[PDB]
Write a protein that binds this ligand. Sequence first.
Ligand code: HEC
Ligand code: HEM
Ligand code: HEM
Ligand SMILES: CO/N=C(/C(=O)OC)c1ccccc1COc1cc(C)c(I)cc1C
Ligand SMILES: CCCCCCCCO[C@@H]1O[C@H](CO)[C@@H](O)[C@H](O)[C@H]1O
Ligand SMILES: [Zn+2]
Lengths: 96, 241, 69, 380, 61, 80, 49
Amino acid sequence: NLIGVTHTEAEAKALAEEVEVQDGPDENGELFMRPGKISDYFPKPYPNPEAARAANNGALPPDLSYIVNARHGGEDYVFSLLTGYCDPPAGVVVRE
Amino acid sequence: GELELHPPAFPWSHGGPLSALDHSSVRRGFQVYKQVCSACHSMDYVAFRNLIGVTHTEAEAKALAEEVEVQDGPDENGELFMRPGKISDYFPKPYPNPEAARAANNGALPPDLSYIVNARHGGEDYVFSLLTGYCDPPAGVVVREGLHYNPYFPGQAIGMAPPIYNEILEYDDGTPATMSQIAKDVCTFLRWAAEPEHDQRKRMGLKMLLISALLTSLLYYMKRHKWSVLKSRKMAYRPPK
Amino acid sequence: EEELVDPLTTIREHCEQTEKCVKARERLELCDARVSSRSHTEEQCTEELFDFLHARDHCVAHKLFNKLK
Amino acid sequence: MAPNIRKSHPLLKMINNSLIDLPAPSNISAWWNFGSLLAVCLMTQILTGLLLAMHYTADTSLAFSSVAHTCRNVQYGWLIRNLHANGASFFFICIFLHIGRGLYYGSYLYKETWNTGVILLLTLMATAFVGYVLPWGQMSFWGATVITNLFSAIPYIGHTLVEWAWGGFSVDNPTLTRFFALHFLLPFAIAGITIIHLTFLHESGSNNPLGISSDSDKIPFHPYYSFKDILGLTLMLTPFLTLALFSPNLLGDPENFTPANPLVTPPHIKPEWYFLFAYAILRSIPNKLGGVLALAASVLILFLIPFLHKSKQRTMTFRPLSQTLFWLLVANLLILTWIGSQPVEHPFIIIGQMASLSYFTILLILFPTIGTLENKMLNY
Amino acid sequence: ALLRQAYSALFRRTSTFALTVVLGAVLFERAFDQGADAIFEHLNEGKLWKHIKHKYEASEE
Amino acid sequence: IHFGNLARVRHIITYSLSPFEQRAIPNIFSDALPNVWRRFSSQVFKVAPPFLGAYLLYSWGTQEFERLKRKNPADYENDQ
Amino acid sequence: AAKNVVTQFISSLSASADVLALSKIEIKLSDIPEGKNVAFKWRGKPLFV
Ligand code: HEC
Ligand code: HEM
Ligand code: HEM
Ligand SMILES: CO/N=C(/C(=O)OC)c1ccccc1COc1cc(C)c(I)cc1C
Ligand SMILES: CCCCCCCCO[C@@H]1O[C@H](CO)[C@@H](O)[C@H](O)[C@H]1O
Ligand SMILES: [Zn+2]
C-alpha cells in the first residue's frame, strides 16, 4: 500500500523484509518462518487480545487501521490525546 | 479407459425404502471407528451429542466425549489450553492438517469419513468390499513398496493398510468380532454418520406416499366430476334449410 | 467347541466351488501359469482375476449377511 | 363502473383476467399443464432457495461446511435442501416437456411468447449453473472451471472476459461470492420475464392440439383448467418427492461430497443430466472454439424454429411423417444425453459426433424439408 | 343415510363445510400420524433406538 | 373483453347435464379402455421405433466398449 | 400436508442443533468450596456462581 504513496517499490520491499512472518505448513506440517514481502500485512504485536491485555494491564491497544474514523473528532481528537497528558486536578484520584 | 471391478450389492438391513438403520449395528459400527479408524481418519461433521437418542445414552455420550482432551481458549494470558471433552464437541481429528497426516501414512491422505459413503460410487456396498477384500496381486501386477493390493480400489494400489482382522477388538455387546461382521457394522455406521436423517426421511417418504396416493385419487375424481359436463356433452348442427 | 470363525471365509469357500466360480478360477490359474513362466510378457491376469472375484463376491453377498448380525 | 368486484378492481382484474375468466380452448391436453407447473416450480425453488440462503455462507472456506451444517443442524434443513436440488431437476423436466410440446404443436408460431420462452430457458440454465458452484464441492469447482474456461476460446476479447468473470486468475472466492449473488438474482429475473411470457400469450390465447380456431368452443380456465392443473401438479410432485424422499442422490454425482480442491481433478467431470445433451455436443467438436459455438447454437438454434416452419398446418397431429422425425429427434437427445455421461473413447466419440450432427440436421434440414414435401402430399 | 345427513349438516352451508374440514383435518392428523408411525416402526422391529433403549437406560455401572 | 368477439357461429345446439346428474368416470370398460388401447395402438409405430432403435445403439455402443477393454490373447502368443 | 410443510419451513428459521447445544450449561453444586468464586462461560457472556 505504501508504494506510490510514501515509499519506493524498493523501500517497501526492504521495509517489508525487516520483519519475519509465519507461513506454511511445510512438507512436515510444521509452521515456519520467512522474511516479509510487500504482499504482507503490517505485523500484529500480539497474537490475540487476551495476550495484549496481559502486557498493558487489562488495557487493549486497539488496532489503528480505522481508528481516526472510529473515534469522534478523528485526528483532531487522536492528536489532542497524545499531545495532552497531564496531572489530575483536585479531587481526581487516578487508580494505579 | 482401464479395467476396474465393481463391488457386488449386499442387502443392507437399511436398504429398503421403508427400512431404517439397525441402530444396534450403528452403535457398534461407531466403536469400530472410534477404536480403529479414528486413528488416521477424521469425522469432522459428527459430534458426540449426535450419538444421543441414536446409539447412546445422554450419559454414555457425555462420558464418551470426556475420554478426549480438546484445545480451547485462549485464556487470561492468551495461551491455548487443554480441557476434557463435552457433548458439544466434534469427533477429534487424528492429525492437525493433511500435510501432517500424509507424513504419517506415506504421502497417503486418509480422507475424512463423514460423507465418505456418499462420496464414493457404490457407497457402503463399496466401502465394504474394500475392507473385506485385500489380497495378493495376480501375475504381472507389481505393487510399489508402501502400497497394498486391493482389487476393489482403482489402480489396485491403495495406501491404506488392511485395517481390520478378526477379534481386532471386542464388541462389549457380545457380538462376535469376525472381520466381515466388523466391516459390516462400520459401513452401517458410515451411512448413519453421513445422513443422520436417513430414518426420519424414510418415515416421511411413507407418510408422503400415503397422503399423496389418497389426495391424488380425490383430485382425480373432482377433475373428472367437473369435466364430465364437457365429456358428456352432445351437439347437433340444425340449420334452417 | 466354540472356535471363532469368520462366516466370510466360509461362504467364500462354498462359492469357489460353483459352476461359474470354477469355470473362472480355472481361467485364472491358466493365465497365471503362463504369465508366471514367461519372462518377457506384458500380460497381466487382472481381467481374469476380476472375473473370478466378481463372480465369487456376488455369490458371497447373496448369503454372507445371513450370518452376520 | 362494474357489478361484481373482480373486473372493476385494478388488481383482481389481473388475478381474474389471467387465471379465472381466461378464455381457454376446450381441448388442450396434458401437454399444457407444464405451463403452470413451470410456474409453481419457480414459486417453490425461490422459496426453498431463500430458506437455504438464510443458512449459507459464500466463502471458499465455509461454503461446503455451511451447506453441510445446513443439512445436519438446521431444522428440516436437509429436507429443504433436497427439495431445492431436486426442484432443479423437476424444473428442467417440466421445461423440456413444455418445450417439446410447443415444438410438436407449432406453439412457436406465437413468436413472442416463444422467444420470451427461449430466454426464460437461457436464464434458467445460467441460474442452475451458478447454483451448482455454491456447495463448492469437487464437481462444483471443476464444472465451474471447465465451462468458464471455454470463454477463453473467443479471439482477443475473451482471454480477458474470463479473468474478469472470475474476479481473478482462476475460479476462486471472488467467483464463488459473485456467483452466489448471481444465483440470488436470476431467479427473480426469471419470475419477471415469466410475466412478460404469459402476457404475449394472453395476446392470442392457447394454441390447441388440433391447430385450428378454438373460438368456436372455448371454456373458462376455472374450474376446467385450474382443476386439471392441480391434478397435473400432483401427478408430478409425486415422483419428484418420491425420488427426493427415497433416493436423494440418485441423480447427483458423488465427487460433490468431496470439498473442492483445485490441486486434484476428479476422474470424470460431468454435469447434471439436464446439461448432458449439451455437454455431449460441446465435446463432439475438438476445438474449444468450435465446441463452444456448437454448444451455444445447440440451444440458441431454438430461436430459428419459427422461421423453419413450412407446413400449411400447425400441429403435427395430422402429419405422420413429421411426427416420427420429431420422435427421432427426441430420442436423438436421449442419445446425446447418454453420450454425455460417457468418456471420450471410441465408440462414444464417433457416436457422439453423429448424434450432434443429426441433431442440427433435423431442426435445420429435415423438419423444414419433410414439411414442404408433406404439404405437396396433401396436394397444396 | 350418511350421505344425505352429511350433505345436510356438513357439506351444505359453505360455513359448516369449512368448519368440518378444519375439525376433520384435526382428527385426520392426530390419527394418521399414529398409524403411519406405527406402520413404519413395525417394518423396523427392534432396529430403532426406541427398541434397543432398555439396554442402557437404568441398567449399567 | 375476451368472451364474445371471438367468432360468428350459427345453428348449433348443445345439451349437457350437471355433474351431479351424471356419472363420474362413465363406462370404464365399454368405452374407456377400448379407446385407451386404440390410442396406444395408433401411435406405437411412430414413437416406439426410434426409441427402440436407440436402445440398440446404446447397447452396442456400451457392450462394444467393454469388449475393447478385455485383452486379445493374440497379442501374447509369442512372449515366451 | 400444507400445515406440515409450513411447520417444517417455519421451524427451519428457529434455532439449529448446534446453537441449541451451547444453549445450556450446568454446574455441579458438589465441587465448589466456601467463599472462593469461579466463573464460567454462558451464551457468550460469563456466568457467576
Ligand atoms: C492406519 C491408518 C488407517 C486406519 C486407522 C484406517 N484407514 Fe482407511 N485409509 C487410510 C489411508 C492412508 C487411506 C488412503 C489410501 C489412498 O487413498 O491411496 C485410507 C483410505 C480409506 C478409504 C478409501 C479411499 C478411497 O479412495 O476409496 C476408506 C473408505 C477408508 N480408508 C476407510 C477406513 C475404515 C472403514 C477404517 C476403520 C475400520 C479405516 N479406513 C481405518 C488409512 C487408514
Ligand atoms: C421460465 C419458464 C416458463 C414458464 C414458467 C412458462 C409458462 C408458461 C405458461 C403458464 C404457459 C401457458 C400454458 C401452457 O403451458 O401451455 C406457457 C405457454 C407457452 N410457453 Fe412457456 N413458460 C416457460 C418457458 C418457456 C420456454 C423455455 C419456452 C420455449 C422456448 C416456452 C414456450 C411457450 C409457448 C410456445 C407457449 C404457448 C403454449 C401453447 O401452445 O398454447 N415457455 N408457458
Ligand atoms: C431459478 C431457481 C433456482 C434454481 C434453478 C436453483 C438451482 C440451484 C442449484 C442448481 C443448486 C445446487 C444444489 C446442489 O447442491 O445440489 C442450488 C443451490 C442453492 N441455491 Fe438455488 N436455485 C434456484 C433458486 C434459488 C434462489 C432464488 C435462492 C435464493 C435467492 C437460491 C439459493 C441457493 C443456495 C443457498 C444454494 C447453495 C446451497 C445448496 O446447494 O443447497 N437458489 N440452487
Ligand atoms: C458449475 O458447474 N455446474 C455444472 C452443473 O451441471 O451445474 C448444474 C457442471 C458440472 C460439471 C461439468 C459441467 C457443468 C456445467 O456444464 C454446462 C453448463 C451449462 C450452463 C450449459 I448451457 C452446458 C453445460 C455442459
Ligand atoms: C404430496 C404432499 C405430501 C405431503 C406429506 C406430508 C408429510 C410430512 O410429515 C412429516 O413427517 C415427519 C416424520 O414423522 C414428522 O416429524 C413431521 O412433523 C411431519 O410433518
Ligand atoms: Zn462420479
